[PDB]
């Protein structure tokens, strides 16, 4: 088809302040027209009667495990989970093996992702060579090859001068630093420093490890004029510190893992190692703080931190790899904020689309005329379960395995081409 | 006893008078100054020391050389005591190059019966290199007024930039800087500078670009990831050569780091002119201080 | 040390660089009913001689970043909040430092601070008038 | 075009024992028919009247400098030189940066080469991790990703047990070891141990460094049953040792650099650093031995060892990088063996086509019906010069820079598609 | 600009003309050459540098010294850039001693407005030492024609042998070598040499023996087992003294390795004569190049 029409659906493009029941004409992979009752003879038709139409989702925090750990996930299985969950753009983390610290690894990922052809995969580079924390990586070669941000995820940068230098060089290049904030002297145990660690004697990770580094990062972003993006906020104090710096005009953004919105440290008692994550699931008071942070606009976007690990890496909590999968599970997770009247639907969509697009400085997350036809089509009320029938990840590491989910992607359209169908 | 420590201490008239002498010396003026000079190169810099030495000798000044400090580091002995020893030995001039910042200096200079010539003090000043760069630019264009002069590289550690920028400013040129953002002082506005993030934009704006020597040390200090990435981001590459109007480079070139190995001697390069202008400018400084 | 008569613990004029060490010191000191006095200046960002400002740019003297102080003040207020210890910030020299201290005071955190009358009188330009007699940690800003 | 015809040309396919004046029909990238006077309406036509038609050349020894030294050459500039010199398949060496010792580097090269689309680029992996000589590389992952051989080029393997182990594992996988034979205790200087080193006092590389390692490799290939391929033979004793093992049925092959056929150590006196190469140009007696080795079938193929270095890496012989470029210069270099009545034209072609194809175990170097249409078309008498007008390499490091060459490629056809035209 | 890089570039006439000047300078000829020279001794060699320096100064040439390279190793800076800096500083002569082989050199030399004098380049050439050794032998015997001249020691690494042997050959002398077989180039026949395995046989054949300095490094490199065994096998011992006709030694003597500690100054030794002839030969070289 030269021409596609998304018919009958309820359109929400928050970046344009557009809502209502419109059809969308796509041509040559781009948004052509948005208008009431559109028709062109033998233009291809997608029927979205009864469904929500919005811009393709953007997840700025995904581990594709490719190269080097592709038994956990790869670019193809990752890009399948992505599109199955409404994502037309994802940003992959650099903690692969070999790490993303040279242009050969960058180019391998770009070309492989181009072959898989489902989903835009945007790489990030490391902050330090090998993520070893000792020498700054080659920001310039890396940015020029296509990196959109620098992170040492899942390691913190412990030397403040290193973080200061990375922010300077990255800002000079017009790109953000994404920081995994967790001081390694205060966070080397396995779960939250709270009631479960006290009860069971599992080693703990202090909330202050995260807060100390957030405060540091906001100060450095203020002093350097760099843009820092805080990767996974998990406490109330963290959100109070972020807002302290936002209110001063500092370029600091943050994201929330839908898992910290659903679950507390007690999930360790119900899901064992499938609740092991960095930073940890905290207390009830922090969970509710995060929800209030999403409601009151402190948190800029949702980002899954899709972190696949095999089942043998998820047995005894003490020895488990930290991480939870979440690409396919993000939408219905966000949707219970909507059902509970905490956020509007528009607001939910912002946080999956234009908000993350502006954080990485990409012209996506939009249905503006002329922009690429990255479109997501969903049913906020349709039920399903993530199990062996529906799981597209090579891994299963989620406290939501086997639970009933409400809200589901019916179609994912990437550059005018359908890439996922329910 | 007159001294030359800092470009910030020079008035317009003084710069005019030094550059007038420099031009006469370049045109073949001869003069005898019956004096002795000690060249005290605690920090060695062969090129600069040979230039001060040959300038002095061609004026009939007897030169004495202390180099490396001759194993540097006399423990318990200050810089002041060393200078005071030179005074006791009856030297008229002390040309000194030291790895530390000589500050404050006014009161020490006042207390010594010596003509002190700063040949580089750490990261602070290098007045003769400032003047040489100014003279070279002026020889080429006639006037420096309204010229757009871009310095590229390690501005933070640059005594050459700190000596040249104020001279060029004083005579109406416009200064720009471009380098790793980690190496640009936060208050570089004290020098009244345009700041370019991107060296290509800097090259398009500039009448003349002065590449500053990148020291390998900066990589280990984490200011840059590597020398070859620095070359790609900031250096004079073959692709940039087509766009550059004219360029200079103060110290010895760090080839394929600062400037492409093929681009040191070209019709756009004033690098060899700066080497040539060093002796006449340094003769002018000796002469200027012989009052 | 407390039993012999010490009224507070400080590594002045050195910072404590390991946050777990500072956290531990606050815990043990609070258990004893005494404060920690902290010289806040991250040694990776403050190893030069004067303020990172106009005088350092002009003269090329090595500098001490204001963020070295702020980063450690923020750290100390967070640790005092989480441990319930009392931290006393030894010599505040920037506006951001005071905004961070007040952020934690307003939460009921036991954080106090003091000012050196010299930071009230003098800026980094005093280095140009008094030379080494204006050299101090943290610097005149 | 569905259909192509190479008309009027003199066909030589030695693998099939085919010579004479035939036309070739190509369809869907494959050799369809070979026959006297062929015609199909509006099938595309290449006029080869007065020219030699043969299988596309295969060079089993090329440095593409990609990744990591792409200021010297890259996959694109390399593949341009290749096709301009008659090559439709080249084998790249693993001494890149990062080295070819993991599948990410392999895949980067395969996908990049696929984009450039001129020339089949077949990677090799290292023998040891990092080419550091200490640990065997992952032969299995590397072979499975597409490596066709293992070499530590341009380093020797000094530990015989390592070389023995590599041969065992590689033979188990059905692939050869390519060895750079030069004992590093006897070859650490810059030029041949001969008259030029004695005269000038330049440090030397003993011929025995090469011979000792050739002998070692033939013994190990005999004992393990592995296939070893000797990369660049330069002495008469080397050829006597290789033949000693061939005569016993040992799977040992070798190649010659056309530069060792043209030039002796005295070229160091005429071209300076452009004559610096590993192993070095030897004496007149060795040069003539090599030619006799080519004539009498001891040497199995030509392989350029295309080794680009910049001009600043080629000044004082003492400090120069070793290597000479040769992709574009191989044909006319070989052609003076033909003009001097040393080899037949058929024999020349064998050594560029079916001989190297059998060494790497690939079904190419042939115009058999059904095989890919990799065809080279040349003029054995046409003169030209390698200079700034004709050079496709980013480098110029050859003693033949500015010399008149005789013999030239008019067309290169890769999979039925024209990729180079004179 | 004339240069002297290699003994292989000298014609008979040129050697005749240099040695004629050397003899006049030895006999007390005075001359003024109004020039400057930089002595660039990257590899230090006090004895050779003092000899070139005193030769130059006695001719009125102003000399400037760069020694150790003054901490060698300017990273990114070539030998060419250093020479090109000397040219920009206006030096007439560059006397250089470097630890690498300067080859190829023809085209670099042609591109520079400098009189280059090779005072030793690695293991390649040392033309003035060749000439000094030739001159010393010639002063003693009148002519070198038909003399049997034996070099003993590390021939492979010897720039002195590479500079002297071709001069002696050009004038009809016969060269022999004797040393550890590990230190004799396999194609030493390029110099048209007799090779002796045994130093005693070499001593019996020779009119004059030139002991080459053995470097302690050669032991660690496994070319020799020890210095004291080398002395026993190849050195001038007291027992060999009775048989030796006459002998020389270019650098500083490695006592009880090359030559017995008692045998440095004897009536058979021309060692001190070579030291004496260095200044007049080096004056002759400056003069030869002043055209
Ligand atoms: Zn992550
Ligand atoms: Zn090779």
Q: In what order do the strands lie in the sheet with A404-414?
A: A18-20, A10-13, A52-55, A375-385, A404-414, A417-421
Nearest to E218 by CA among E207, E226, E208: E226
Residue A289 Cα to chain centre, angstroms: 20
At E248, which helix (H) or strand (E)? strand E247-248
Radius of gyration of chain B (CA): 19
Give the Cα separation of E85 and E91 in Å (integer). 9
A-contacting residues in D 94-123 (Cβ below 8 Å) = 98, 102-105, 107-108, 111-112, 115
Contact D59, D91 (CB under 8 A): yes
Give the Cα separation of C34 and C9 in Å (integer). 8
Q: In what order do the strands lie in the sheet with E148-152?
A: E193-196, E174-178, E148-152, E208-211, E247-248
Q: Where are the domains of chain D?
A: 1-55+366-422, 56-365
Give the Cα separation of B134 and B144 in Å (integer). 8
First to last CA, chain E: 7
Nearest to D285 by CA among D235, D340, D211, D214: D235
The residue with tokens 């050799």 is: D31
Using DSSP's 3-state secondary structure scheme, residue D53 falls into strand
Q: Which positions of A are annotated as active-site residues?
A: 305
Query: How many Å lie between the centroid of ligand 2 and the Cα of residue D305?
Result: 5
* A375-385 and A52-55 beta bridge pairing: antiparallel
Contact C21, B118 (CB under 8 A): no
Number of C-alpha atoms within 13 angstroms, CB side, residue C59?
23
Kindly state the greatest CA–CA separation across chain D: 69
**Interacting residues of E126 by C-beta distance below 8 A, sequence separation 6+:** E118, E119, E120, E159, E160, E162, E163
**Burial class of E168 by CB neighbour count within 10 A (0 to 12, 13 to 18, 19+):** buried
Number of residues that make up chain D: 422
Beta bridge partners of E125: E121
Quickly count: other Cβ atoms within 10 Å of residue A360's Cβ: 23
**Burial class of A233 by CB neighbour count within 10 A (0 to 12, 13 to 18, 19+):** buried
Query: How many Å lie between the centroid of ligand 1 and the Cα of residue A324?
Result: 10
Contact C90, C12 (CB under 8 A): yes
**Does residue B116 have a cis bond before it (omega within 30 degrees)?**
no
Sign of CA dihedral B68, B73, B77, B80: positive
Q: Do A138 and B180 touch (CB under 8 A)?
A: no
Nearest CB among C18, C66, C99 relative to A185 is that of: C18
Radius of gyration of chain D (CA): 21
**Burial class of D402 by CB neighbour count within 10 A (0 to 12, 13 to 18, 19+):** exposed
Q: Do C74 and A219 touch (CB under 8 A)?
A: yes
**Burial class of A294 by CB neighbour count within 10 A (0 to 12, 13 to 18, 19+):** buried
Nearest to B37 by CA among B76, B9, B3, B10: B3
Give the 3-state DSSP-derived string for chain A, with helices as H, strands as E and coil as C: CCEEEEECCEEEEHHHCEEECCEEEEECCEEEEEECCCCCCCCEEEECCCCEEEECEEEEEECCCCCCCCCCCCHHHHHHHHHHCCEEEEEECCCCCCCCCCHHHHHHHHHHHHHHCCCEEEECECCEHHHCCCCECCHHHHHHHCCCCECCCCCCCCCHHHHHHHHHHHHHHCCCEEECCCCCCCECCCEECCHHHHHHCCCEECHHHHHHHHHHHHHHHHHHCCCEEECCCCCHHHHHHHHHHHCCCCCEEEEECHHHHHCCCCHHHHHHHHHCCCCCCCCHHHHHHHHHHHHCCCCCEECCCECCCCHHHCCCHHHCCCCECCCCCHHHHHHHHHHCCCCCHHHHHHCCCHHHHHHHCCCCCCCCCCCECCEEEEEEEEEEECCCCCCCCCCCCCCCCCCEEEEEEEEEEECCEEEEEC
Query: How many Å lie between the centroid of ligand 1 and the Cα of residue A154?
Result: 5
Give the Cα separation of E253 and E270 in Å (integer). 13
Q: How far C52 CA lies from chain B's nearest CA (Å)?
A: 7
First to last CA, chain C: 35
Burial D43-52 (b: 16+ CB within 10 A, else e): bebbebeebb
DSSP conformation letters of chain B:
---B--GGG--HHHHHHHHHHHHHHHTT-------EEEEEESS--HHHHHHHHHHHHHTT-EEEEEETTTTS--TT--HHHHHHHHHHTT-SEEEEEESS---S-HHHHHT-SSEEEEEEETTTB-HHHHHHHHHHHHHHHS--TT-EEEEES--TT-HHHHHHHHHHHHTT-EEEEES-GGGS-TTGGGG-EEEESSHHHHHHH-SEEEEPPPPTHHHHTTSSS-HHHHHHHHSB-HHHHTT---EE-SS---BTTTB-GGGSSSTTB-HHHHHHHHHHHHHHHHHHH--
At E176, which helix (H) or strand (E)? strand E174-178
DSSP conformation letters of E223-237:
SSS-HHHHHHHHSB-
At D229, which helix (H) or strand (E)? strand D228-230
Residue D294 Cα to chain centre, angstroms: 15
Would A1-55+366-422 and A56-365 be classified into the same CATH topology? no
At D141, which helix (H) or strand (E)? helix D139-145
**Interacting residues of E207 by C-beta distance below 8 A, sequence separation 6+:** E141, E147, E148, E149, E245, E246
C137 is in an annotated binding site: yes
Give the Cα separation of B156 and B177 in Å (integer). 11
Radius of gyration of chain E (CA): 19
Give the Cα separation of D187 and D154 in Å (integer). 12
The residue with tokens 């010539």 is: B117
Quickly count: other Cβ atoms within 10 Å of residue B129's Cβ: 26
Residue A374 Cα to chain centre, angstroms: 17
Residues from chain E contacting residue D203 (CB–CB below 8 Å): 123
Contact E213, E129 (CB under 8 A): no
Q: How many beta-carbon pairs under 8 angstroms link D with E?
A: 58
DSSP label at D306?
B
Contact D109, D120 (CB under 8 A): no
Establish if C82 touches chain A: CB-CB under 8 angstroms.
yes
Contact E256, E263 (CB under 8 A): no
Give the Cα separation of B244 and C98 in Å (integer). 48
Number of C-alpha atoms within 13 angstroms, CB side, residue E161?
33
Nearest CB among A159, A183, A241 relative to C19 is that of: A183
Give the Cα separation of D210 and D202 in Å (integer). 19
* D120-123 and A228-230 beta bridge pairing: unpaired
Q: Which two tokens stand for residue D360?
A: 């790497």
Q: Which two tokens stand for residue A145?
A: 């090859």
Number of C-alpha atoms within 13 angstroms, CB side, residue B188?
23
Q: Which two tokens stand for residue B223?
A: 């200011």
The residue with tokens 């835009």 is: A120
CATH number of D1-55+366-422: 2.30.40.10
Q: Which two tokens stand for residue A14?
A: 């928050």
Residues from chain E contacting residue D319 (CB–CB below 8 Å): 100
Residues from chain B contacting residue E90 (CB–CB below 8 Å): 54, 279
Which residue of B227, B257, B261 is the best one to mutate when testing the D interface, meaning the one whose CB has the most D CBs within 10 A?
B261
DSSP label at E74?
-
Establish if E88 touches chain B: CB-CB under 8 angstroms.
yes
Resolution in A: 2.3
Give the Cα separation of E137 and E144 in Å (integer). 7
Nearest CB among B57, B256, B276 relative to E62 is that of: B57
DSSP label at D130?
G
- Taking CA atoms, C66 is separated from A224, B56, B182, C59, D215, in Å, by 11, 46, 16, 18, 68
Give the Cα separation of A348 and A6 in Å (integer). 21
At D348, which helix (H) or strand (E)? helix D345-350
Contact E37, E63 (CB under 8 A): yes
Kindly state the greatest CA–CA separation across chain B: 56
Contact D267, D279 (CB under 8 A): no
Give the Cα separation of A150 and A167 in Å (integer). 9
Sign of CA dihedral B175, B178, B180, B182: positive
Q: How was this structure determined?
A: X-ray
Using DSSP's 3-state secondary structure scheme, residue E259 falls into strand
Which residues in chain C are followed by a discontinuity, with C-to-N distance exceeding 2.5 angstroms?
none
**Does residue A67 have a cis bond before it (omega within 30 degrees)?**
yes
Give the Cα separation of E168 and A17 in Å (integer). 96
Q: Which two tokens stand for residue E113?
A: 């407005």
Contact A377, A87 (CB under 8 A): no
**Interacting residues of A341 by C-beta distance below 8 A, sequence separation 6+:** none
First to last CA, chain A: 21
Beta bridge partners of E269: E247
Burial B33-45 (b: 16+ CB within 10 A, else e): bebebbbbbbbbb
Phi, psi of B134 (to 5 degrees): -60, -50
Q: Which two tokens stand for residue D384?
A: 């030209």
Q: How many beta-carbon pairs under 8 angstroms link A with B?
A: 34
Is the CATH number of domain D56-365 3.40.50.450? no
**Does residue C138 have a cis bond before it (omega within 30 degrees)?**
yes
Q: Do B225 and A165 touch (CB under 8 A)?
A: no
Query: How many Å lie between the centroid of ligand 2 and the Cα of residue D138?
Result: 21
Nearest to A13 by CA among A302, A371, A258: A371
DSSP label at D171?
H
E-contacting residues in B 234-253 (Cβ below 8 Å) = 252-253
Q: At what angle do helices C19-32 and C66-83 cross, to 10 degrees?
A: 50
Give the Cα separation of B288 and B17 in Å (integer). 8
Phi, psi of A56 (to 5 degrees): -50, 140
Q: Delineate the domains of chain E, giving CATH numbers in brackets.
A: 1-125+270-291 (3.40.50.1370), 126-269 (3.40.50.1370)
DSSP conformation letters of chain C:
-TTTT---B--TTSPP--HHHHHHHHHHHHHHT-PEEE----TTTB-SSEESSHHHHHH---EE-HHHHHHHHHHHHHHHHHH---EEE-----HHHHHHHHHHHTTT--EEE---HHHHH--TTHHHHHGGGG--SSPP-
D-contacting residues in E 171-190 (Cβ below 8 Å) = 185-190
The torsion region of residue B115 among left (phi > 0), alpha (psi -120 to 50) and beta comes to beta
Contact A1, A43 (CB under 8 A): yes
Residue B74 Cα to chain centre, angstroms: 27
Contact A96, A68 (CB under 8 A): yes
Give the Cα separation of A10 and A47 in Å (integer). 11
Using DSSP's 3-state secondary structure scheme, residue D97 falls into coil
Nearest to D72 by CA among D307, D371, D295: D307
Give the Cα separation of A24 and A36 in Å (integer). 9
Query: How many Å lie between the centroid of ligand 1 and the Cα of residue C19?
Result: 23
Phi, psi of D113 (to 5 degrees): -65, -35
Nearest to D351 by CA among D154, D60, D150, D123: D60
Number of C-alpha atoms within 13 angstroms, CB side, residue B134?
32
* D177-179 and D191-192 beta bridge pairing: unpaired
Q: At what angle do helices B271-289 and E79-88 cross, to 10 degrees?
A: 50
DSSP conformation letters of E103-161:
-S-HHHHHT-SSEEEEEEETTTB-HHHHHHHHHHHHHHHS--TT-EEEEES--TT-HHH
- Taking CA atoms, A306 is separated from A65, A406, B210, in Å, by 10, 19, 49
Q: Which two tokens stand for residue E283?
A: 């004056």
């Amino acid at each position: 088809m030269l021409k596609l029409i998304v018919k009958n659906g309820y359109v929400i493009d928050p970046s344009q302040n557009l809502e209502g029941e419109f059809d969308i004409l796509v041509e040559n992979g781009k948004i052509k027209k948005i208008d009431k009752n559109i028709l062109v003879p033998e233009a291809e038709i997608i029927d979205a009667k009864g469904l929500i139409v919005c811009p393709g989702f953007i997840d700025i925090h995904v581990h594709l495990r490719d190269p080097g750990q592709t038994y956990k996930e790869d670019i193809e299985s990752g890009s399948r989970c992505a599109v199955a969950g409404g994502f037309t753009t994802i940003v992959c983390m650099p903690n692969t093996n070999p790490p993303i610290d040279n242009t050969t690894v960058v180019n391998y990922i770009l070309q492989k992702s181009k072959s898989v052809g489902l989903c835009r995969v945007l790489p990030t580079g490391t902050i330090t060579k090998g993520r070893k924390g000792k020498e700054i990586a080659d920001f310039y070669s890396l940015k020029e090859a296509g990196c959109v941000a620098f992170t040492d995820d899942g390691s913190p940068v412990m030397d403040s001068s290193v973080m200061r230098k990375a922010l300077e060089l990255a800002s000079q290049l017009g790109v953000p630093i994404m920081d995994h904030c967790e001081d390694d002297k205060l966070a080397y145990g396995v779960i939250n420093e709270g009631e479960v660690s006290a009860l069971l004697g599992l080693s703990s990770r202090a909330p202050e490890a995260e807060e100390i580094q957030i405060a540091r990062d906001g100060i450095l972003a203020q002093r350097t004029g760099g843009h820092v993006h805080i990767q996974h906020v998990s406490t109330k104090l963290s959100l109070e510190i972020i807002e302290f710096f936002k209110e001063k005009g500092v370029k600091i953004t943050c994201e929330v893992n839908p898992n910290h919105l659903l679950f507390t440290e007690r999930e360790v008692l119900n899901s064992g190692a499938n609740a092991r994550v960095n930073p940890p699931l905290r207390k009830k008071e922090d969970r509710l703080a995060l929800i209030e942070g999403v409601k009151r606009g402190i948190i800029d976007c949702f980002a899954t931190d899709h972190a696949p690990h095999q089942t043998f890496e998820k047995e005894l909590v003490e020895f488990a790899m930290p991480g939870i999968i979440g690409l396919q599970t993000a939408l219905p997770s966000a949707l219970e904020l909507y059902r509970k009247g905490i956020i509007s639907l528009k607001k939910l969509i912002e946080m999956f689309t234009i908000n993350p697009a502006r954080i990485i400085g990409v012209d996506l997350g939009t249905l503006k005329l002329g922009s690429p036809a990255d479109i997501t089509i969903f049913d906020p009320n349709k039920e399903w379960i993530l199990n062996e029938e529906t799981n597209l990840s090579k891994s299963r590491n989620t406290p939501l395995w086997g639970k009933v989910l409400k809200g589901k992607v019916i179609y994912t359209i990437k550059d005018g081409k359908m890439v996922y169908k329910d | 006893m007159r001294s030359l420590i800092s470009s910030l201490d020079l008035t317009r008239e003084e710069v005019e008078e030094i550059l007038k002498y420099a031009k006469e010396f370049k045109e073949g003026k001869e003069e005898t100054i019956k004096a002795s000079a000690v060249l005290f190169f605690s920090e060695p810099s062969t090129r600069t020391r040979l230039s001060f030495e040959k300038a002095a000798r061609e004026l009939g000044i007897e030169t004495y050389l202390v180099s490396g400090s001759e194993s540097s580091t006399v423990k318990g002995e200050s810089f002041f005591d060393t200078l005071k020893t030179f005074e006791g030995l009856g030297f008229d001039y002390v040309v000194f190059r030291v790895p530390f910042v000589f500050f404050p200096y006014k009161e020490i200079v006042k207390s010594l019966n010596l003509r002190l010539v700063n040949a580089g003090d750490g990261t602070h000043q290098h007045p003769s290199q400032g003047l040489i760069d100014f003279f070279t630019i002026k020889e080429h264009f006639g006037e420096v007024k309204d010229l757009r002069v871009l310095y590229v590289g390690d501005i933070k550690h640059s005594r050459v930039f700190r000596s040249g920028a104020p001279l060029l400013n004083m005579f109406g040129a416009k200064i720009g800087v471009c380098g790793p953002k980690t190496l640009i002082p936060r208050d570089v506005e004290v020098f009244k500078v345009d700041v370019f993030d991107d060296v290509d934009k800097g090259i398009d704006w500039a009448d003349v670009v002065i590449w500053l020597r990148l020291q390998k040390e900066r990589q280990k200090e984490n200011y840059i990831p590597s020398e070859s990435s620095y070359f790609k981001q900031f250096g004079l590459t073959k692709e940039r050569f087509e766009k550059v109007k004219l360029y200079m480079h103060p110290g010895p070139v760090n080839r394929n780091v600062d400037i492409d190995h093929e681009l040191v001697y070209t019709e756009k390069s004033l690098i060899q002119e700066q080497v040539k202008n060093g002796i006449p400018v340094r003769k002018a400084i000796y002469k200027f201080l012989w009052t």
